[PDB]
Write a protein that binds this ligand. Structure first.
Ligand SMILES: Cc1cc2nc3c(=O)[nH]c(=O)nc-3n(C[C@H](O)[C@H](O)[C@H](O)COP(=O)(O)OP(=O)(O)OC[C@H]3O[C@@H](n4cnc5c(N)ncnc54)[C@H](O)[C@@H]3O)c2cc1C
Ligand SMILES: Cc1cc2nc3c(=O)[nH]c(=O)nc-3n(C[C@H](O)[C@H](O)[C@H](O)COP(=O)(O)OP(=O)(O)OC[C@H]3O[C@@H](n4cnc5c(N)ncnc54)[C@H](O)[C@@H]3O)c2cc1C
Lengths: 574, 574, 104, 52
């Protein structure tokens, strides 16, 4: 028996933990995954010296923990088996595939991460705020009051994540790109550093934030927090919440302990689901919310009819570029070079402080030192120069988020023939209109690896604005990228596999009124009709957004916690 | 100040820790890598529920922690850059490559793992003994005494690793393949389970062993061992040992703390190097053993002239097969099937104990239940059937090790189009003759990612016996595998990239006499001429071996610890 | 729909087709060898502006076909090589090999 | 395919691809020598590799 139970130990669950453990609630948290990031529980797996010296290997780590949500039955023809080998007569269900899935209306790139800390163990830590046009309303008919509320929440969320915009300010490549794009779009678009949930520890090491940053996930009471109460239970699959007869309250949480195999009911005053956009929905559907099975509008469900509808996923375009000769020569514009590299009298110099220098002294010193110490190397960029981290945020005249940067994803690893210092990644993210027909639903026959109802998508990018903007977004990427350099062969401009972006929203969406705003939770993230059930995550976000959603989801979870603290009393510490 | 300092926390360092910590020595261990599995320090990363339900994803984890030893300068022609992009005029040194490396005499697949627990955090746990023909001599001119010593050591090593041969006894696939091969080679070759360092926890869950199994790596004293003394220091690069003026003793170990950036000297009575076959050699050359730079036979090194010569790496052939129709039909040979799948008529039965059954009751029961529970599935093999784990060990008439199995490596993932239940992996491993001209050496100008001298290979598989056997081994895999099924398209029979097998030996090889046996350590693993310096690992093995070397290296380490215990004494527990 | 855009290249002395004095081709004739880069300046700037033009123009018709994304083709695959025995009025002043009658 | 079958490359540089998975019994090069009509005069980075 606990005051609060939280399902999931991702950054959103840890937001609820931080808020409620701190306020004196007896808290339990359950995760289906295990502790596997080091002694700092739920920390970023990239915060090892070895990964930061070998960042392209972290692509492999990510791939290793993204498990595909819905894989359609495979129809590739393998007709070169030996005549003796067992050969199929049909395209039957193999290897965890989902026969409910139409391969042409899927989010084939969608995937989940089952580890303590969730996806925050591997994420790229971009935490921008949404502008009004992307953002859900928290106050109606008062834009000033809605703005003040969002500013209060985002400020606190940025504090929990340790969001900053200064960690790359001494990068030559970052400044080279930023300054060039600022000049090219002067009077039209503003560029800045990507806001990043990160703290620089040295010139070569960044401590990337994660769930751990938000809440350290250590059991309490402990020496550091003698009056707090928290227990984390990894390797526990949360299967369903049990509704009372009245459908006014949750009476228990049904769990499966994966190590012992035992199933138990857990009681709490308050139940918080923060299992991700897909798995919150799965859990609720397994509990009798929404409708199980292939949707049937002829029999709409009794509870939360909008659950699993109006789902949104962003369009993503990607390419890489190879820096222009002009930009590379600009790096060493202030230098006077004498002699021939490798010879006695080879000399690279500049005049510190000269009013006719294009670059600050700190930049010129780093370039001079690289060029004098590494005379075998043809480029003026220092070897351990930090990555560029540039953005022009979403605006009405360019309604997509942009990142002009380098980081580790499940795709786009730098390959060896072109120097990594030349390579810049371009990721533009579109906003998707919420449409009723875009659905996540769950099979009533097929189950996943944890014997839970198999998720199935029925998704296409809506026609009209979403599609028009997606294609203009691609063109914008082609036009903007050319100011920096040409495309890298092998990473030409392309739309990425739908859902690979992992920015799914609207699966359990928020609004003021269940029927009028076609939604599942209110602005306190409380499930309509229920006193004591709350959802956290990108699943709550009901709008068309292009920017990265985690910071906004956290802000909503903070607001949710404000309601819980007002409406539930912590039990006595005994 | 310590009694013993160990460099490296892989399974071999952990052998020295288990032995010396357990005997009261004050031990410090340093690792360049970090604690990054879970709370069980240095434990196997595949021991999560999620990876045991999603084993093909563990391939990506392995890829993410194998950092290539020596990558030659890249010479791929990229001639489709935009004319505005910066374009190279030469094949200059990019992306950490090694300009010392001849690409045609490399072990391009050789890689290292820098994490606490080393490669034991990901390995596949096969731990066979070497027979006499593969094994170094520990007792000269007394084969019975030599056999008795090896039996004693291997038995203790098997207990440390928890090696067993029973964990896959109830697998249908294992027994299907084992039985067929046994019958096909009756009176010619014997087959058995691969000996595996692993403990079954449930019908679907195996606790794979690791460094953690050997020694839990917790700091001591602690509640469970109050009189023991042990400290593990992760993220510490050990750089060199300091020789005394007469080259009879080590005076200190120089380290680099990677977090603070500071360097320090650590003093011990005994110095143990267990950093792996490549990195032990690196550290020693950086300490003035052998010679830095490109080998020059005109100027032989003063100390340990055989260091880095006579290196061995195994030839590796690989394919996968798709089970024969005949073997699949035999799975259900004992079944009477009435009616049609999916109908209420459908019935699958067998007679328990019948003399005409080809298979035991346990097998028929699992097949029956699978066929009745999954009537849509066309195969008779149960879905959670454990993997096959079959071998016929190295013998004079087939001088290679064999594995006929399924497990996760950096290559060979099961894709989607063929059912995984049908697929068997074949890995045959050849023995390589030690030859002086096969070398691992270290650059005197190029450094690696940790500013240490860059490793460089000069390697070809020896003509003569090694090459003959390697091609005969390929043929043997083609002939044997055909008894089970034809090749799986996309995993056709091939030699793997040299060194991808990660069984490198002989870099700091053992023998009785430094000069006569061309070696670096004696049979106590003590460096010739030095009282207090010991090496552990596959680098000590001086013979041509085909079986997996780690159990043999562990056995050597145990023998080495016997010497240390006879010659050095713990300090007073303070 | 296929989109092929073709840029113009400034004639530069350093861009050459020459023949080996040792290596021969399949007909035992001196082996052709190129020493070629797209000239910096206008040629390169126009080539990148052309790429961008193709991206902008093509989008009016439809999105890229996966597997045929916008790219520069291998140099010379276009098979529009010129200037190897070039025409002008005056051998010396116009750096040329034939006159306007194509006479050497 | 008809086109491909009558476009003969003008100048192919000496190949430097690393083929390190030959059987140990197979004849294996020690250098990137002139093979299969390649042109050792040719700088691969200043070519018209598509010329035919
Ligand atoms: C390559 C990559 C790059 C990214 N970059 C960005 C970025 O730059 N910015 C940004 O905002 N976002 C980024 N993201 C997305 C981001 O990590 C997610 O939005 C975020 O982690 C969501 O947090 P959450 O706590 O709602 O869910 P998650 O982090 O998904 O955590 C949910 C958890 O609940 C668990 N769980 C699931 N089901 C059950 C169940 N039945 N029972 C018990 N536990 C369960 C999981 O094991 C998991 O730990 C990135 C992610 C990836 C993978
Ligand atoms: C995919 C895969 C499958 C394999 N399967 C098998 C198998 O089935 N059976 C088998 O016998 N073998 C297997 N191996 C090989 C086996 O893992 C190794 O033989 C064994 O781990 C070597 O033990 P070790 O302790 O000598 O070295 P390692 O495990 O390599 O550990 C050495 C350590 O020292 C560290 N270190 C390195 N340099 C320094 C330095 N300068 N300073 C401080 N610390 C340093 C490292 O970070 C590391 O942790 C496999 C390995 C892999 C990768």
């Amino acid at each position: 028996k606990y005051d609060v139970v939280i399902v999931g130990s991702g950054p959103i669950g840890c937001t609820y933990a931080r808020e409620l453990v701190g306020a004196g609630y007896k808290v339990a948290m359950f995760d289906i995954g295990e502790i596997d990031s080091g002694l700092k529980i739920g920390a970023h797996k990239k915060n090892t010296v070895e990964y930061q010296k070998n960042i392209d290997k972290f692509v492999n780590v990510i791939q290793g923990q993204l498990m595909s949500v819905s894989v359609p039955v495979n129809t590739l023809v393998v007709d070169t088996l030996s005549p003796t080998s067992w050969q199929a007569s049909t395209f039957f269900v193999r290897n965890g595939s989902n026969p409910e899935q139409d391969p042409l209306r899927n989010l084939s790139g969608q995937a989940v991460t089952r580890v303590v800390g969730g996806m925050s163990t591997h994420w790229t830590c971009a935490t921008p705020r949404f502008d009004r046009e992307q953002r859900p309303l928290l106050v109606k008919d008062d834009a000033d009051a809605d703005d003040a509320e969002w500013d209060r929440l985002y400020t606190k969320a940025e504090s929990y994540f340790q969001t900053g915009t200064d960690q790359f300010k001494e990068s030559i490549r970052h400044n080279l790109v930023l300054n060039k794009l600022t000049e090219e779009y002067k009077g039209q678009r503003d560029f800045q550093q990507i806001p990043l949930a990160a703290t620089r520890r040295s010139p070569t090491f960044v401590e990337w934030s994660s769930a751990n940053t938000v809440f350290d996930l250590q059991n309490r009471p402990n020496t550091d927090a003698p009056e707090e109460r928290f227990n984390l239970f990894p390797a526990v699959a949360c299967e369903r919440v049990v509704r009372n007869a009245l459908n006014s309250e949750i009476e228990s949480l049904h769990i499966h302990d994966l190590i012992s195999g035992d199933r138990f009911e857990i009681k709490a005053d308050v139940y918080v689901l923060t299992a991700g956009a897909v798995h919150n929905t799965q859990l609720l559907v397994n509990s009798g919310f929404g409708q199980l099975g292939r949707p049937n509008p002829a029999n709409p469900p009794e509870l939360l009819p909008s659950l699993g509808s109006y789902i949104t996923e962003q369009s993503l375009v990607f390419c890489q570029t190879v820096m222009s000769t002009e930009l590379i020569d600009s790096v060493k514009s202030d230098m006077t070079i004498r002699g021939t590299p490798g010879e006695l009298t080879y000399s690279v110099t500049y005049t510190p402080g000269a009013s006719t220098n294009k670059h600050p002294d700190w930049w010129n010193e780093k370039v001079k030192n690289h060029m004098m110490q590494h005379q075998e190397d043809p480029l003026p960029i220092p070897f351990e120069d930090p990555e560029p981290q540039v953005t022009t945020l979403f605006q009405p005249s360019h309604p997509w988020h942009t990142q002009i940067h380098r980081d580790a994803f499940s795709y786009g690893a730098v390959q060896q023939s072109i120097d990594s210092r030349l390579i810049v990644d371009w990721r533009f993210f579109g906003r998707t209109e919420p449409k009723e027909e875009n659905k996540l639903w769950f099979s009533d026959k097929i189950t996943d690896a944890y014997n839970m109802p198999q998720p199935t998508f029925d998704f296409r990018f809506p026609a009209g604005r979403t599609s028009k903007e997606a294609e203009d977004m691609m063109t914008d990427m082609c036009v903007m990228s050319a100011k920096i350099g040409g495309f890298l062969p092998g990473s030409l401009p392309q739309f990425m596999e739908p859902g690979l972006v992992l920015h799914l929203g609207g699966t359990h969406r928020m609004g003021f009124d269940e029927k009028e705003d076609n939604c599942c939770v209110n602005t306190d993230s409380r499930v309509f009709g229920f006193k004591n059930l709350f959802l956290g995550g990108c699943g709550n976000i009901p709008t068309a957004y292009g920017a990265n959603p985690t910071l906004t989801a956290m802000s909503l979870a903070i607001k949710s916690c404000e309601y819980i603290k007002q409406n539930f009393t912590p039990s006595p510490f005994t």
